[PDB]
Write a protein that binds this ligand. Structure first.
Ligand SMILES: [Co+2]
Ligand SMILES: [Co+2]
Lengths: 343, 338
């Protein structure tokens, strides 16, 4: 009675054959995962950086943003391990555009088959230039379509407490960042990381598009992402120390989100969070092993009226490209100074 | 590299044929929905009560509890519409027993096919005696197995913020209560009711067990459940006034959970919460239209028959006293409203 209808869906295995990953795409995803692992588990002293748009609505602009980011990654690879944000799924406050899978046409036609094709084509195009990607793992079905492409998964502030997303994370073959909750408190992420580290058994969709009982192995590469919230921002040295005091033995290093609840409603604050983070890093802070940045070709955002401006987010406001380059070069400087401190 | 394997799963349609609902089961589930709807939308001045075990681990014990509750429910029906907590799925802080469906043998062997069979035979056995049942809709696939037997579903405090659960709610055939968040504020529940009231498009599993694109109609029978949290309890008149101030036009009445956050880690606080909620109702508070109670045959919990293996519950005799007091308050609110 509250189901209007059911529309047929291509299976993951079918889409995978229709839109094959190239050798370079696969190698790139596996390398992004290796690097990310070595960073969050303390083998490598670079910083892991998840940077790029709040969301992708335009494959072409995303390809342009990706070329510029790959060129900067090649320059800064001694110091930073860069993964593009290629976020396909957007959790809303109430209602609103959910991303490129859900409504690729951004006009309320909900052509999900075309979204999945667009998403997977997008993921092959990005990783095919040797730039690893990451996305929020919001949907528990869509990762079957995409995950051979993905080097980093986030669980959002609004789904960190959810048992289903913890279950999902325990069966993903790549590192997973759990956001702290929207109230700004870290306990729920730390609990999520503990839960996701265990084996889970749950009903899930397989590559053939049918439900089966899944057993996961447990994901030892989950870590906490600090992204502020109601109680205040949490990127400063005191908030970090407070976070370090509640991590259990076995913990991975922390990531700091410059945007969202750490930006205080203003994308112009991302560079000021960077200054504070860099000062911690440059001074010896080893527990901060990653950062996340909402960056686009151009700054700010816009409403949805294809009468959209090029390279401008239609979800959260982003810093523009030239500011991103400043931010990243500053962070790379900071990473270098930390090595001096560590000797 | 992180999937240990897949085991075959009976489809929803198959289990519905193997464990068919009786005509009484079906009619009972329908009636429970009608009654819950009339109360939360203000058409009926009785209070809707979701009461029973924190979780079901024992079918026979649950039946015995259900027979007692059905008899109390007959006594008090002029004043309360009662739905049994038949909770199959338990969200954990980190890890631990997830309920009857996930691990019916409660010993880490996870026979989900037997858990779904036990769950469905349970839901049939309870509704077949004319008692409606409610459960937390934690798993988004599960409901395909059991929906047709359910009169109330809960989205729990740890999932009210989750877009997948708002989507799920938006396509459920029955009223849904969203708990406030574990920090104790209700904004996220208010946001969820707004979200679930809209039509959604999303990948879902159908009755023949394959993934398809679902379009829902949107669920206008969603309401907030007050269940306390880190910021404090929220069952008192100030909390209720603050809650009513937050509600949009077109809102349904509020439900107050006596337990979880509102019990401050002590199941013996449920009867005190009851007295506070009773005072408000008796004195004319018309926005409180629901309550939720964790109740079992015997009180407490454990890590022993008729005793919860999850959260601590009040026992059957206390349960009687609580609901008869609630019924009286409903009567007094009627007088106030004349
Ligand atoms: Co954003
Ligand atoms: Co409970």
């Amino acid at each position: 009675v509250r189901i209007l209808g059911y529309d047929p869906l291509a299976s993951p295995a079918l889409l995978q054959v229709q839109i094959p990953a190239t050798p370079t795409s696969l190698e790139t995803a596996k390398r992004g995962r290796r690097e990310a692992i070595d960073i969050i588990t303390g083998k490598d002293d670079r910083v892991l950086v998840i940077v790029g748009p709040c969301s992708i609505h335009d494959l072409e602009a995303a390809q342009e943003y990706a070329l510029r980011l790959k060129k900067l990654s090649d320059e800064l690879k001694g110091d930073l391990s860069i993964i593009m944000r290629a976020y396909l799924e957007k959790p809303r406050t109430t209602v609103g555009w959910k991303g490129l899978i859900n409504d690729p046409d951004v006009n309320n036609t909900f052509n999900i088959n075309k979204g999945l094709q667009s998403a997977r084509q997008l993921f092959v195009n990005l990783t095919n230039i040797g730039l690893p990607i990451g996305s929020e793992m919001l949907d528990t079905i869509s990762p079957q379509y995409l995950a051979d492409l993905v080097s980093f998964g986030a669980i959002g502030a609004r789904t960190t407490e959810s048992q289903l997303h913890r279950e999902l994370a325990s069966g993903l073959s790549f590192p997973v960042g759990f956001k702290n909750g929207t109230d700004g408190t870290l306990n729920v992420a730390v609990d999520a990381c503990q839960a996701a580290a265990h084996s889970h058994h749950f009903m899930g969709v397989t590559k053939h598009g049918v439900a089966a009982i899944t057993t996961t192995k447990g994901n030892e590469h989950c870590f906490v992402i600090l992204r502020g919230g109601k109680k205040g921002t949490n990127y400063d040295a005191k908030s970090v120390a407070e976070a370090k005091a509640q991590l259990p033995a076995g913990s991975n290093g922390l990531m700091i989100d410059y945007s969202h609840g750490n930006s205080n409603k203003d994308f112009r604050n991302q560079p000021k969070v960077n200054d504070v983070v860099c000062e911690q890093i440059a001074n010896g802070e080893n527990a901060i092993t990653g950062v996340m940045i909402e960056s686009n070709i151009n700054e700010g955002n816009q409403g949805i009226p294809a009468g959209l401006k090029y390279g401008v987010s239609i979800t959260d406001a982003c810093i523009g490209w030239e500011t991103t380059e400043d931010v990243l070069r500053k962070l790379a400087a900071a990473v270098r100074q930390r090595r001096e401190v560590n000797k």
